[PDB]
Design a binder for this molecule. Structure first.
Ligand SMILES: NC(=O)CC[C@H](N)C(=O)O
Ligand SMILES: [Zn+2]
Length: 746
């Protein structure tokens, strides 16, 4: 009998219970006892769900109130002094680190190339590692909970090498290399593992996902060092677990480890199987990650079972486990909550709950149990998807054949374009602009029910546009925005107006802490049926003689912030999105909106995890899909791009050939753009929470020393959606007043 395994379950609750109770706690409506009660209930619910499904190896310690990495920081006493001076209990120290205290919060960081964020482990020279036993030892206590329910679980802990390597030296210790602290942390891991075995844990999932990165040789050697120290008869068996990538470049590092087994991601990298299976020693198990833990597609059982069979061939059926490819943290909780999706489409999907049934069916299948009814129903679902008209749109398929270098190049290089733009706009030196958003629900809500006219709703959006435009005029901004009050979010607003997308009612996935996202789903070939943004931009331009920026989200961001298709490449999807947005750009320009900003916040997030062909191909096609969107315009049309990064690759920025770029900036990297003719707006203040006309005049005089004033735009770090009016007013006034003082001396 081949076992099934789940590497982690999302903890938000099928009804977002966790959000409700954590936010109620943080607001004071709920006690900490009520919060812990709800967490216990959620875990119990999830453990029973997995047991009922038939899952053999069920996780524990996967639950969290905020972040599992943060949970290990707490447990291991990686707690900076600043969070201990407030008389907080252990859980409120946790929340303080996670979300600050109203001390700013520890840094939030993308978890590999997933859409989840963890809280960066933060270490000092003074860090003293030890088991915080005051709180409770979370993994022991939750194992013990599950056991009292009659559920044996496998505790999940992030391993020592990854935990340190993904961490960072605190402000006070800028010279510390986190991985040097390995000898100090190992005893604390060993102790935790002894306690788990004593509680009755026979196996632990020890996550070492840093194995899918490019690791320095000096870091590669630390696996043998760590795992030699931990394994022994007084600890559970350890299953060294990787996901999201290819371990092959690091095989030498793990080829001689004493651990009980390994897990690999054969969804993202099925081709690594032969080689990784080759390092397995007699006695070691191979966990075959074959049900995707980061997307929503029903798994092809025929294909997944074949992969598992390849593994069985290598190491024996006794030593193979059918697993999720990663934790199901990255997927929504339950497809049965969806009430609006057409049943044809819904048939193509599986969310977390359904993935439990999948790993179980695939394990039965390879074990020789009769699951022919389930295989046949699955083969039907797969065939229906691949045959559907939603999936392949001949028009889009033909249009993709027009893509090339030419379609992705402007009519003239920037120097000739600048001449034509200068003639048209005559923008002064140190032109001032902002990034788009300014400081809601009832009219939206009643429009959605038919309680107010299309006519009635358009009036309030327009009044708000008007308010914002007059504001920016009043304070003398040179290139204006409409404020984006009609938009809810920067991806759904587009996806809802594109063919090839589906939307959930309840497909929530945790992004960070209690902030959850409900991504769009790309189901098929994408196209744009009609204008998406034109009406509001035109209105906004009709009420000022200042140039008005059109505002779009780029193709890569729409792709990366959606659940993508798993039957066609990322590239193909981004190019279809580039083509759709090209039509939008063409419509904006035709209608007189000839300054257009395209925002690509998610470019760095999608970067392939290792150096090599895949990474360089990605940078090439990311840039190309942007250029396909933006290259049809006249020379006198001014294309802007905004990036929410401080040190994004200068090379990639040049590849976009945007007339103007805005970059967050509030070291010497401004010099990288010296002999690059296109214009740059280095963000002057953090819109996350007034500077003075002097503080600005010092910041611009600072920058102005390393960069030509003729190329320099003045703007904030990002949109001011997430701010209040009174500080927006004073902050922007100062900003413009500053520019004018420079504008005077040139
Ligand atoms: N996140 C972003 O890229 C912000 C873009 C958007 N135009 C805004 O100003 O809110
Ligand atoms: Zn930004």
């Amino acid at each position: 009998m081949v076992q099934s395994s789940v590497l982690g379950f999302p903890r938000i609750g099928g009804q977002r219970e966790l959000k409700k109770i954590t936010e109620a706690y943080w607001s004071g409506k709920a006690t900490v006892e009520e919060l812990l009660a709800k967490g216990k209930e959620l875990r119990e619910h999830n453990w029973k769900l997995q047991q009922k499904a038939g899952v053999d190896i069920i996780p524990s310690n996967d639950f969290s109130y905020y972040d599992q990495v943060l949970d290990l920081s707490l447990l291991f006493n990686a707690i900076p002094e600043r969070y201990t001076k407030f008389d907080l209990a252990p859980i409120d120290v946790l929340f303080a680190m996670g979300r600050g205290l109203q001390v700013t919060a520890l840094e939030m960081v993308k978890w590999f190339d997933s859409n989840y964020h963890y809280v960066r482990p933060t270490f000092s020279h003074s860090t003293e590692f030890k088991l915080n036993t005051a709180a409770g030892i979370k993994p022991v206590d939750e194992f013990n909970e599950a056991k009292a329910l009659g559920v044996q679980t496998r505790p999940v802990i992030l391993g020592p090498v990854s935990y340190l390597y993904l961490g960072k030296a605190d402000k006070d210790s800028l010279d510390l290399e986190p991985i040097s602290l390995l000898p100090k942390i190992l005893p604390v891991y060993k102790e935790l593992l002894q306690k788990l075995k004593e509680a009755g844990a026979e196996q632990v999932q020890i996550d070492e996902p840093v194995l899918v990165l490019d690791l320095p040789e000096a870091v590669q050697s630390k696996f043998k060092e760590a795992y030699d120290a931990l394994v022994g008869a007084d600890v559970p068996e350890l299953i060294l677990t990787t996901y999201f990538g290819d371990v092959r470049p690091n095989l030498k590092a793990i080829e001689n480890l004493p651990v009980a087994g390994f897990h690999f991601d054969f969804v993202r990298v099925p081709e690594q199987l032969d080689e990784v299976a080759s390092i397995l020693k007699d006695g070691q198990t191979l966990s075959a990650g074959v049900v995707d833990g980061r997307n929503i597609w029903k798994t092809d059982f025929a294909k997944a079972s074949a992969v598992v069979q390849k593994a069985i061939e290598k190491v024996g059926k006794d030593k193979v486990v059918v697993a999720t490819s990663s934790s199901l943290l990255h997927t929504p909780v339950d497809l049965e909550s969806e009430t609006k999706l057409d049943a044809v489409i819904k048939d193509w999907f599986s969310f977390a709950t359904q993935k439990l049934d999948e790993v179980v069916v695939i394990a039965k299948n390879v074990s020789g149990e009769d699951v022919s009814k389930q295989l046949e129903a699955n083969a039907a679902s797969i065939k229906a998807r691949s045959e559907s008209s939603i999936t392949n749109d001949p028009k889009v398929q033909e249009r993709l054949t027009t893509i090339n270098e030419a379609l992705a190049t402007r009519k003239a290089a920037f120097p000739e374009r600048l001449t034509e733009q200068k003639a048209k706009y005559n923008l002064p030196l140190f032109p001032t602009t902002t990034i788009g958003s300014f400081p809601i629900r009832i009219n939206r809500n009643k429009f959605a029910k038919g309680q107010i006219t299309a006519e009635e709703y358009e009036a309030f959006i327009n009044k708000e546009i008007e308010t914002v435009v007059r504001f920016q005029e009043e304070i003398g901004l040179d290139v204006l925005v409409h404020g984006e009050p009609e938009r809810n979010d920067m991806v759904q607003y587009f996806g809802e107006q594109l063919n090839g997308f589906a939307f959930t009612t309840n497909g929530w996935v945790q992004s960070y802490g209690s902030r959850y996202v409900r991504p769009p789903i790309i189901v098929g070939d994408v196209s744009r049926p009609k204008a998406m943004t034109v009406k509001e931009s035109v209105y906004a331009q009709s009420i000022t003689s200042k140039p008005m920026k059109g505002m779009l989200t780029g193709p890569v961001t729409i792709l990366r912030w959606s659940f993508p298709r798993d039957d066609v490449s990322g590239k193909i999807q981004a190019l279809q999105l580039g083509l759709a947005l090209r039509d939008e750009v063409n419509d904006l320009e035709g209608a007189g909106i000839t300054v257009i900003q395209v925002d690509e916040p998610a470019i760095r997030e999608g970067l392939p995890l290792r150096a090599g062909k895949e990474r360089s191909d990605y940078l090439n096609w990311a840039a190309q899909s942007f250029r396909v969107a933006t290259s049809g315009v006249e020379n006198s049309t001014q294309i802007h791009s905004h990036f929410c990064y401080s040190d994004l690759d200068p090379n990639h920025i040049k590849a976009l050939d945007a007339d103007v770029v805005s970059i967050e900036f509030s070291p010497n990297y401004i010099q990288e753009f010296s002999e690059y003719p296109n214009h740059i707006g280095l963000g002057l203040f953090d819109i996350h929470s007034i500077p003075s006309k002097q503080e600005f005049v010092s910041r611009i005089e600072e920058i102005l020393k390393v960069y030509p004033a003729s190329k320099f735009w003045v703007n904030p770090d990002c949109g001011l959606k997430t701010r209040g009016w009174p500080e927006v007013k004073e902050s922007l006034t100062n900003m413009v007043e500053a520019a004018k003082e420079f504008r005077a001396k040139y």
